[PDB]
Amino acid sequence: AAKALIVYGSTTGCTEYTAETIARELADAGYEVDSRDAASVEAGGLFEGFDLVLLGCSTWGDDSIELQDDFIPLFDSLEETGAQGRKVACFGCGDSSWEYFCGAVDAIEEKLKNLGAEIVQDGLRIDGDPRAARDDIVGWAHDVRGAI
Numbered sequence: 001a002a003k004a005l006i007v008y009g010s011t012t013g014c015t016e017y018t019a020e021t022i023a024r025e026l027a028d029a030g031y032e033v034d035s036r037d038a039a040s041v042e043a044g045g046l047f048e049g050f051d052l053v054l055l056g057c058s059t060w061g062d063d064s065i066e067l068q069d070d071f072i073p074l075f076d077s078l079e080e081t082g083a084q085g086r087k088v089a090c091f092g093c094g095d096s097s098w099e100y101f102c103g104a105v106d107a108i109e110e111k112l113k114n115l116g117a118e119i120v121q122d123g124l125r126i127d128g129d130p131r132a133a134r135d136d137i138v139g140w141a142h143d144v145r146g147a148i
């Protein structure tokens with residue numbers, strides 16, 4: 001009955017597997033889940049019709065914090081997605097060898113807050129292998145549902 005959208009930007013598959021794991025948790029709890037690669041979406045009205053939106057994005061950049069490339073157009077047009085009043089939470093893969101660990105998650109959360117979204121949980125930051133972190137991912141999904 002409640003509808004969740006998960007949109008992920010992933011280049012090596014880490015954030016995509018994380019998104020799949022979240023989608024299964026939410027669907028087992030009774031949500032209808034639509035999980036979309038950011039490469040396939042357009043920003044205008046993207047969040048319309050959804051009760052919960054989860055945004056996943058890995059972090060990149062040779063010497064600066066950059067978002068995963070398929071997520072950049074969505075971030076640049078986040079003001080047109082329908083985020084005002086929307087229950088959101090963010091997740092992403094990264095590598096703690098880097099100073100700005102999952103820094104894309106911070107950038108997306110900051111812009112969502114300016115846009116009036118309701119961030120329902122602190123962002124999930126996956127370091128290294130996501131299958132190794134599966135219990136952390138499922139637990140975070142449970143906590144997001146519990147904060148609605």
Ligand SMILES: Cc1cc2nc3c(=O)[nH]c(=O)nc-3n(C[C@H](O)[C@H](O)[C@H](O)COP(=O)(O)O)c2cc1C
Binds near residue numbers: 010059099
């Ligand atoms: C050039 C480069 C820069 C990166 N910069 C960061 C970074 O600043 N912070 C971070 O947490 N991870 C950084 N990473 C690591 C990745 O985000 C990590 O490999 C991640 O697992 C990719 O997730 P994805 O498969 O979902 O795209 C960097 C990786 C590369 C190759």
